[PDB]
């Protein structure tokens, strides 16, 4: 969980572009937006994190395993986006 802190502290600091310790609406929107330009290497890295078996596809079971671990995925992503 020191890794849990590090990654969390890391993402927060990157979203909080003005460094005032909090994320504004504009900051959140700016962060989300930088994915319209998600790099090829970055996509490959995320793919490897969810495609557990490394067969080159995310199966429904692999997606479910991810979703069960991140319940604030589907509720938020499914509904909003």
Residues annotated in a binding site for Ca(2+): 16, 18, 20, 22, 27, 51, 53, 55, 62
**Are 51 and 62 spatial neighbours (Cβ–Cβ below 8 Å)?**
yes
Q: Segment 11-30, which members bind a second copy (CB under 8 A)?
A: 11-12, 14-15, 21-25, 28-29
**Number of neighbours of residue 53 by Cβ within 10 angstroms:** 10
Two structure tokens written together for 36: 């319209």
CA 36 remoteness from chain centre: 13
Interacting residues toward a second copy by CB under 8 A: 3-4, 7-12, 14-15, 21-25, 28-29, 31-38, 40, 42-47, 49-50, 56-60, 63-64, 66-81
């Amino acid at each position: 969980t020191p890794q849990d802190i590090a990654d969390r502290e890391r993402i927060f600091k990157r979203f909080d572009t003005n460094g005032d310790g909090k994320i504004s609406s504009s900051e959140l929107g700016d962060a989300l937006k930088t994915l319209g330009s998600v790099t090829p290497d970055e996509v490959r890295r995320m793919m490897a994190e969810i495609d557990t078996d490394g067969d080159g596809f995310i199966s429904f079971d692999e997606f479910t395993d991810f979703a069960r671990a991140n319940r604030g995925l589907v509720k938020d992503v499914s509904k909003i986006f």
